[PDB]
Amino acid sequence: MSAKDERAREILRGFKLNWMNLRDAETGKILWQGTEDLSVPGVEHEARVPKKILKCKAVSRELNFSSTEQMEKFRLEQKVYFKGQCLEEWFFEFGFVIPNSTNTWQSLIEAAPSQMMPASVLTGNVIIETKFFDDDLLVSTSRVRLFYV
Ligand SMILES: O=C1c2ccccc2N[C@@H](c2ccccc2F)N1c1ccccc1
Ligand SMILES: O=C1c2ccccc2N[C@H](c2ccccc2F)N1c1ccccc1
């Protein structure tokens, strides 16, 4: 165990995703919302999402989170996996996090013209992997399996 491993565990222990939603970045329409902490590691989460999301050039995300611990550079790396192959990756940076704060993070997520296979082929075969970092310290990795409905 290193000092860094111990730190990453303290950060994870103090972290919660309280709620989240997704919107077409054209309409601002809600496409999905939830309060399950999809960031919790070690379980495969499941989400059902409307199939039309696949027709959106971009989506806007609101992610509401609490952190007991101070973070210098809170960031995420997110990958779409189809039957085990990475189709697309995104990097997003929140930056400094105040200890014991609760924060809403808005992000614009742009698909590359990926999300090209039909929803019927995709559904149950897509995993979004999310890695949570503070700078280069890996805090956690979680996974959501997607169903398009
Ligand atoms: O941002 C998230 C997200 C945030 C915290 C924890 C897990 C996440 N996984 C996906 C995501 C968001 C909403 C619904 C399902 C889903 F898999 N996700 C997402 C949404 C769009 C593009 C890339 C990742
Ligand atoms: O299915 C989605 C999607 C659905 C809900 C939440 C996150 C998702 N990640 C991407 C995606 C789809 C549309 C717009 C942006 C985007 F990152 N995405 C996707 C999936 C497979 C191939 C390409 C993009």
Short mmCIF file of C-alpha atoms and ligand atoms in Angstrom, two decimals:
data_model
loop_
_atom_site.label_atom_id
_atom_site.label_comp_id
_atom_site.label_asym_id
_atom_site.label_seq_id
_atom_site.Cartn_x
_atom_site.Cartn_y
_atom_site.Cartn_z
CA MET A 1 0.00 0.00 0.00
CA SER A 2 1.36 3.37 -0.92
CA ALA A 3 0.48 6.77 0.33
CA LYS A 4 -1.21 7.39 -3.03
CA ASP A 5 -3.33 4.17 -2.79
CA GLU A 6 -4.42 5.21 0.71
CA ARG A 7 -5.29 8.67 -0.61
CA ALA A 8 -7.28 7.30 -3.51
CA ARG A 9 -9.31 5.16 -1.08
CA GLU A 10 -10.04 8.15 1.20
CA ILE A 11 -11.28 10.09 -1.80
CA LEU A 12 -13.50 7.19 -2.94
CA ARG A 13 -14.82 6.70 0.57
CA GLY A 14 -15.88 10.42 0.73
CA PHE A 15 -17.39 10.57 -2.77
CA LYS A 16 -21.03 10.15 -3.82
CA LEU A 17 -22.86 10.83 -7.12
CA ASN A 18 -26.21 12.14 -5.91
CA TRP A 19 -28.02 12.44 -9.23
CA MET A 20 -27.52 12.90 -12.90
CA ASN A 21 -29.32 13.60 -16.15
CA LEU A 22 -28.69 13.79 -19.89
CA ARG A 23 -30.11 16.17 -22.56
CA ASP A 24 -30.08 16.68 -26.38
CA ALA A 25 -27.75 19.59 -26.77
CA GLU A 26 -29.99 20.80 -29.66
CA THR A 27 -33.43 20.88 -27.90
CA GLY A 28 -32.29 20.77 -24.29
CA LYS A 29 -34.82 17.84 -24.07
CA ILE A 30 -34.25 15.42 -21.02
CA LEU A 31 -33.31 12.07 -22.40
CA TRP A 32 -32.46 10.31 -19.08
CA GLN A 33 -32.34 10.93 -15.34
CA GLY A 34 -31.39 8.94 -12.32
CA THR A 35 -30.33 9.05 -8.70
CA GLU A 36 -28.48 5.69 -8.56
CA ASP A 37 -24.84 6.18 -7.98
CA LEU A 38 -23.59 4.72 -11.32
CA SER A 39 -20.04 5.46 -10.16
CA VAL A 40 -19.94 2.76 -7.56
CA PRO A 41 -17.23 0.31 -8.53
CA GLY A 42 -17.31 -3.44 -8.66
CA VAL A 43 -20.95 -3.94 -9.81
CA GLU A 44 -22.06 -3.75 -13.34
CA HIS A 45 -24.76 -1.11 -13.43
CA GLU A 46 -27.54 -1.17 -16.02
CA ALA A 47 -29.25 1.76 -17.63
CA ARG A 48 -31.98 2.05 -20.07
CA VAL A 49 -31.77 5.02 -22.43
CA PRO A 50 -33.97 6.18 -25.19
CA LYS A 51 -32.84 4.94 -28.55
CA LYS A 52 -33.01 8.47 -30.05
CA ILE A 53 -29.92 9.50 -28.08
CA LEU A 54 -28.06 7.65 -30.79
CA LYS A 55 -29.33 10.24 -33.32
CA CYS A 56 -27.97 13.24 -31.33
CA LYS A 57 -24.80 14.98 -32.40
CA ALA A 58 -24.18 16.04 -28.80
CA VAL A 59 -25.67 15.51 -25.37
CA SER A 60 -25.44 17.77 -22.27
CA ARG A 61 -24.87 16.08 -18.89
CA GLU A 62 -25.57 17.37 -15.38
CA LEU A 63 -23.75 15.38 -12.74
CA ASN A 64 -24.32 16.28 -9.04
CA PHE A 65 -21.69 15.00 -6.61
CA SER A 66 -20.47 15.33 -3.03
CA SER A 67 -16.88 14.91 -1.83
CA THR A 68 -15.66 14.96 1.72
CA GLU A 69 -12.11 15.18 0.39
CA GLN A 70 -10.40 18.08 -1.32
CA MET A 71 -9.38 17.28 -4.89
CA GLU A 72 -6.79 19.20 -6.89
CA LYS A 73 -7.89 18.12 -10.37
CA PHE A 74 -11.04 16.00 -10.45
CA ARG A 75 -11.45 14.53 -13.94
CA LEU A 76 -13.00 11.63 -15.79
CA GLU A 77 -11.97 9.35 -18.70
CA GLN A 78 -14.92 7.68 -20.30
CA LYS A 79 -14.94 4.91 -22.99
CA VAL A 80 -17.66 3.28 -25.00
CA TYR A 81 -17.06 -0.50 -25.38
CA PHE A 82 -18.91 -2.61 -27.93
CA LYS A 83 -18.56 -6.34 -27.33
CA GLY A 84 -15.27 -5.58 -25.61
CA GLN A 85 -13.89 -3.12 -28.19
CA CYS A 86 -13.42 0.60 -27.50
CA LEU A 87 -15.34 2.64 -30.06
CA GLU A 88 -14.88 6.12 -28.55
CA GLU A 89 -13.15 7.85 -25.58
CA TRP A 90 -13.83 11.22 -23.83
CA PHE A 91 -11.84 13.25 -21.33
CA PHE A 92 -13.58 15.75 -19.04
CA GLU A 93 -12.12 17.97 -16.38
CA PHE A 94 -13.95 19.40 -13.36
CA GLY A 95 -10.76 20.82 -11.65
CA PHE A 96 -10.57 21.84 -7.97
CA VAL A 97 -13.07 20.39 -5.48
CA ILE A 98 -13.70 22.02 -2.07
CA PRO A 99 -13.71 19.49 0.84
CA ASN A 100 -17.26 18.67 1.99
CA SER A 101 -18.82 20.35 -1.09
CA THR A 102 -21.66 19.35 -3.25
CA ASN A 103 -21.31 20.43 -6.89
CA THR A 104 -23.22 20.33 -10.18
CA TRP A 105 -20.95 19.68 -13.15
CA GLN A 106 -22.31 20.44 -16.64
CA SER A 107 -20.59 18.93 -19.66
CA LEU A 108 -21.18 18.80 -23.43
CA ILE A 109 -20.57 15.35 -24.89
CA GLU A 110 -20.07 15.09 -28.66
CA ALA A 111 -20.33 11.77 -30.49
CA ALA A 112 -18.11 11.11 -33.54
CA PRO A 113 -20.38 10.12 -36.56
CA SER A 114 -19.51 5.48 -33.70
CA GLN A 115 -23.39 5.40 -32.83
CA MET A 116 -23.70 4.50 -36.40
CA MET A 117 -24.81 0.79 -35.73
CA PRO A 118 -28.56 0.45 -35.09
CA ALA A 119 -29.85 0.55 -31.52
CA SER A 120 -31.08 -3.11 -31.99
CA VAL A 121 -27.44 -4.30 -32.51
CA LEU A 122 -26.07 -2.09 -29.79
CA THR A 123 -28.50 -2.82 -27.05
CA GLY A 124 -27.03 -4.89 -24.17
CA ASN A 125 -23.68 -4.95 -25.98
CA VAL A 126 -22.46 -1.50 -24.96
CA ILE A 127 -20.52 -0.82 -21.74
CA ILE A 128 -19.57 2.70 -20.68
CA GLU A 129 -16.50 2.56 -18.53
CA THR A 130 -15.87 5.61 -16.33
CA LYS A 131 -12.53 6.27 -14.63
CA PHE A 132 -12.54 8.83 -11.83
CA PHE A 133 -9.17 10.59 -11.23
CA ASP A 134 -7.71 13.27 -9.08
CA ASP A 135 -5.00 14.44 -11.43
CA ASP A 136 -3.18 11.13 -12.28
CA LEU A 137 -4.36 9.27 -9.23
CA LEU A 138 -6.96 6.64 -10.23
CA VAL A 139 -9.73 6.76 -7.65
CA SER A 140 -12.17 4.35 -9.21
CA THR A 141 -13.42 2.55 -12.32
CA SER A 142 -17.04 1.76 -12.88
CA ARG A 143 -19.20 0.29 -15.65
CA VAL A 144 -22.73 0.76 -16.97
CA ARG A 145 -24.27 -1.61 -19.47
CA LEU A 146 -26.69 0.16 -21.84
CA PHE A 147 -30.03 -0.88 -23.20
CA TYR A 148 -31.62 1.27 -25.86
CA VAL A 149 -35.37 1.43 -25.65
O1 LIG B 1 -21.29 10.55 -17.75
C1 LIG B 1 -21.69 9.39 -17.53
C2 LIG B 1 -21.56 8.82 -16.26
C3 LIG B 1 -21.26 9.60 -15.16
C4 LIG B 1 -21.01 8.99 -13.91
C5 LIG B 1 -21.04 7.62 -13.77
C6 LIG B 1 -21.30 6.84 -14.90
C7 LIG B 1 -21.54 7.44 -16.12
N1 LIG B 1 -21.79 6.64 -17.22
C8 LIG B 1 -22.46 7.25 -18.41
C9 LIG B 1 -23.86 7.26 -18.27
C10 LIG B 1 -24.65 8.39 -17.97
C11 LIG B 1 -26.05 8.29 -17.84
C12 LIG B 1 -26.70 7.08 -18.10
C13 LIG B 1 -25.92 5.98 -18.41
C14 LIG B 1 -24.54 6.07 -18.50
F1 LIG B 1 -23.85 5.04 -18.82
N2 LIG B 1 -22.00 8.64 -18.59
C15 LIG B 1 -21.83 9.13 -19.83
C16 LIG B 1 -22.78 9.84 -20.55
C17 LIG B 1 -22.46 10.29 -21.85
C18 LIG B 1 -21.21 10.03 -22.41
C19 LIG B 1 -20.26 9.33 -21.69
C20 LIG B 1 -20.57 8.91 -20.41
O1 LIG B 2 -25.08 5.36 -26.45
C1 LIG B 2 -24.52 6.39 -26.13
C2 LIG B 2 -24.83 6.96 -24.91
C3 LIG B 2 -26.06 6.80 -24.29
C4 LIG B 2 -26.28 7.24 -22.99
C5 LIG B 2 -25.26 7.80 -22.28
C6 LIG B 2 -24.00 7.91 -22.88
C7 LIG B 2 -23.79 7.45 -24.15
N1 LIG B 2 -22.54 7.59 -24.77
C8 LIG B 2 -22.56 7.79 -26.28
C9 LIG B 2 -23.15 9.01 -26.80
C10 LIG B 2 -24.34 9.02 -27.57
C11 LIG B 2 -24.86 10.20 -28.07
C12 LIG B 2 -24.19 11.40 -27.86
C13 LIG B 2 -23.03 11.42 -27.12
C14 LIG B 2 -22.51 10.24 -26.60
F1 LIG B 2 -21.34 10.30 -25.88
N2 LIG B 2 -23.36 6.63 -26.77
C15 LIG B 2 -22.87 5.87 -27.78
C16 LIG B 2 -23.03 4.48 -27.74
C17 LIG B 2 -22.50 3.64 -28.72
C18 LIG B 2 -21.77 4.20 -29.76
C19 LIG B 2 -21.56 5.59 -29.78
C20 LIG B 2 -22.11 6.43 -28.80
#
